């Protein structure tokens, strides 16, 4: 059927108003005249008298300018009467469509954008988004296609387009390779978004793109070569400083230096890093010995906490350490010596040579040894040979000087030096016994009660050692065989038994005990015997 | 009883904007067209601009990049705004109403008022 | 813009004689939805708003006597008081309001000769 097509008004018209938009007509008009009216929002319904038409002749007219932002269509229904009033038609719908002018500038969201990316970004790497928006129809014309360029880039030193950016999407990705931080940190692009495909309204914006610092720099040794020094026995001593610089960004991973010693497989020597500075303090973890290496020449590594990205070259310093020689105590060889002497040693006689060794390399050194303990007074040695001589006669039965059946005596060793240093030595002496001893009772006071006395044991002591202590014999000498009698407590004959022969009278006595262990005699004239008046156990 | 009624700042200093109030009275905003236009002392008229019932606006030609004209219906009242005003600007302002019967010539005005643009 | 140029500048008459004004239009007024020339007469009398006194190229405005004549089509308009009063005096500015922007003419002012 044919109908009405849409009826098109360009928005923002400028007069004169009211301007005919269309004429409508029945057909009942060759009956009788009709009389046309419309309805709808925008001629009786607000929007109210924006469209009118003319009764009679059934024009519509439009009175103002119209706004498609605002209202973008409007829906009329024009209606048919005869001259008596009633419908001469069905209302018939009218579509009014506001046509778009360009009349909306693009508008970016946001007046700063913000971006950020990392150095050495390949092409085509997404680096940031910028958006903006048109009012105008989008759908019917161009009126609304914004297209994105780029206009100034600050700097330009690299490249004069470090970057690029998509008509239709707007972003923004790199497009040339030589992106480096310590060179240029900071980019910043006005970007220009632009209707009818770049060709119409135009509006600016500024996005800010930043520089991630990547670890593509190494730390270089500001001296390469360094010089030490060190005494000889000293631990965590330093011997010098480490002098590194990274061009990366300060108090990050990719800054701060990790020092490693290359050559040190006894883990002698230890570097540890100084936050402060980002230098590297290089001290001795071990003690060093001067005999055993003079000279040390470390190589030593810096690298940072975190990996390096791209391939550089690892710096490596070079530090000769320089051993200082300290005078050191005579060991003695060795630490103690062991000879066995007879106890009964001639005086003048020689013992052993106890000699020591000076550990320094270095010359020059005289070994004077002199006696250091000597409780009994029984050693000499000479300054130059270190020969033990005795000085008086030797007793293994002392128990004081000699405790065990050994005496222990120690020897210096003054050397020559700068700092005199005294080794000390031991000398175990074994004293061989010989029978030099003679046997005693050991309770020379004996009581017995007058009446009933009780018989009793006297042990014998003898202060040699075996066989110069077996058996034993026992004898009762100056008479006393009249009124004592004595004998064995037991086979091993180790000690007697003593009682009262006779009944005798209250006092004390005096017996002469003669003891013998093996061809070695002792009378002990002072077995004191006192009989007293008591009957059985006798206290006192 | 259609009425309109200018009111603003009598004295403006030069570089400084200017803000007048048009109050209406007697018929709708919405559905008729207000007027700006200026006088200078001793001098002809000089059409500003226009508000229409819609909402849309025109303006002169030569201070487009200068004026904007708003309206607030509820308060029936139009607004004239105009920016970096200097010596030729001193002039008598007035707001008219018009509607599309007349072709939106300008049958009431208001009294006028002064703007004088000075230090 | 629409150029309005508006002849003479200066006119004085004495009290009963005819004053004529004259007006150009750089292109057409006619709208030819209505067939009305959007042309209008403003009179402004020394220390008053303007008043409207013709629109649409001949019809007077409301309190308008009728010595006050428009008349004229196409781009050639003209004002006439077919006989001057004293109350008269008064500057007269055409405007054209047939498409935005609006714009006034250089205005005639009438002064009277006794």
């Known amino acids: 059927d044919w109908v009405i097509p849409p009826i098109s008004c360009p928005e923002n018209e400028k007069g004169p108003f009211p301007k005919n938009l269309v004429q409508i007509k029945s057909n009942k008009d060759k009956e009788g005249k009709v009389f046309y009216s419309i309805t709808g929002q925008g001629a009786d319904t607000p929007p109210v008298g924006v469209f009118i038409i003319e009764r009679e002749t059934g024009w519509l007219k439009v009175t103002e300018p119209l706004d498609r932002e605002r209202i973008a269509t409007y829906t009329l229904f024009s209606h048919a009467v005869s001259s008596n009033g009633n419908a001469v038609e069905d209302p018939m719908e009218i579509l009014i469509t506001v046509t778009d002018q360009n009349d909306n500038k693009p508008e970016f969201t946001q007046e700063v954008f913000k971006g950020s990316v990392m150095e050495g970004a390949l092409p085509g790497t997404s680096v940031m988004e910028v958006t903006a928006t048109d009012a105008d129809d989008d759908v019917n014309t161009y009126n609304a296609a914004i297209a994105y360029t780029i206009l100034s880039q600050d700097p330009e030193l690299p490249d004069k387009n470090m970057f690029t950016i998509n008509r239709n999407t707007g972003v923004i990705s790199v497009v040339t390779t030589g992106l480096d931080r310590e060179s240029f940190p900071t980019y910043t692009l006005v970007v220009q978004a632009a209707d009818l495909q770049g060709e119409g309204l135009s509006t600016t914006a500024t996005a800010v793109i930043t520089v991630t610092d990547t670890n593509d720099n190494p730390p270089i040794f500001n001296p390469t070569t360094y010089k030490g020094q060190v005494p000889e026995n000293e631990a965590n001593v330093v011997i010098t400083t480490l002098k590194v610089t990274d061009a990366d960004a300060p108090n990050t991973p990719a800054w701060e230096a990790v020092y490693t010693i290359l050559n040190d497989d006894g883990g002698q020597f230890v570097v540890t890093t100084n936050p402060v500075n980002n230098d590297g303090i290089l001290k001795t973890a071990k003690g060093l010995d001067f005999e055993a290496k003079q000279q040390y020449i470390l190589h030593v590594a810096v690298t940072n906490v975190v990996p390096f990205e791209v391939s550089l070259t690892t710096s490596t310093a070079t530090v000769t350490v320089d051993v200082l020689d300290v005078n050191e105590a005579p060991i003695f060889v060795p630490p103690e010596k062991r000879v066995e002497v007879s106890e009964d040693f001639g005086v003048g006689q020689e013992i052993t040579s106890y000699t020591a060794q000076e550990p320094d390399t270095f010359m020059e050194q005289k070994i004077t040894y002199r006696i250091w303990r000597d409780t009994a007074n029984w050693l000499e040695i000479n300054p130059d040979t270190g020969a033990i001589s005795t000085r008086a006669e030797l007793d293994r039965e002392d128990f004081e000087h000699v405790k065990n059946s050994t005496y222990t005596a120690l020897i210096i060793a003054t050397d020559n030096g700068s700092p005199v240093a005294t080794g000390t030595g031991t000398l175990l002496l074994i004293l061989s016994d010989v029978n030099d001893n003679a046997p005693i009772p050991e309770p020379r006071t004996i009581f017995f009660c007058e009446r009933n006395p009780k018989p009793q044991v006297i042990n014998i002591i003898d202060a040699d050692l075996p066989p110069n202590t077996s058996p034993f014999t026992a004898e009762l000498t100056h008479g006393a065989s009249a009124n004592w009698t004595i004998q064995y407590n037991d086979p091993t004959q180790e000690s007697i038994i003593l009682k009262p022969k006779m009944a005798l009278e209250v006092g004390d006595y005096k017996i002469n005990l003669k003891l013998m262990d093996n061809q070695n005699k002792d009378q002990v004239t002072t077995l004191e015997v006192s009989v007293c008046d008591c009957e059985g156990a006798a206290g006192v | 009883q259609v009425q309109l009624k200018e009111s603003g700042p009598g004295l403006v200093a030069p570089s400084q904007s200017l803000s007048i109030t048009c109050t209406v009275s007697?018929?709708?905003?919405?559905?008729?067209?207000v007027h700006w236009v200026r006088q200078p002392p001793g001098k002809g008229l000089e059409w500003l601009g226009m508000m229409w019932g819609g909402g849309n606006t025109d303006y002169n030609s030569a201070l487009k990049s200068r004026l904007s004209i708003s309206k607030d219906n509820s308060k029936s009242q139009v607004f004239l705004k105009m920016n970096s005003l200097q010596t030729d600007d001193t002039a008598m302002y007035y707001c008219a109403s018009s509607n599309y019967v007349l072709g939106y010539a300008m049958d009431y005005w208001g009294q006028g008022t002064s703007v004088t643009v000075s230090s | 813009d629409i150029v309005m140029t508006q002849s003479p500048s200066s006119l004085a008459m004495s009290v009963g004689q005819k004053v004529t004004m004259n007006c150009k239009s750089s292109q057409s007024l006619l709208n030819s939805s209505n067939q009305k020339n959007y042309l209008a007469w403003y009179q402004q009398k020394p220390g008053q708003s303007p008043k409207l006194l013709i629109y649409?190229?001949?019809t007077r405005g409301s309190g308008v006597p009728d010595r006050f004549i428009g008349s004229g089509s196409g781009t050639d308009f003209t004002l006439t008081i077919s006989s001057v009063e004293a109350e008269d005096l008064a500057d007269y500015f055409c405007?054209?309001?047939?498409?935005?922007?609006?714009?006034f003419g250089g205005g005639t002012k009438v002064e009277i000769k006794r």
């Open positions: 649409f190229t001949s």
């Open positions: 405007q054209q309001h047939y498409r935005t922007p609006h714009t």
């Open positions: 007697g018929f709708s905003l919405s559905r008729y067209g």
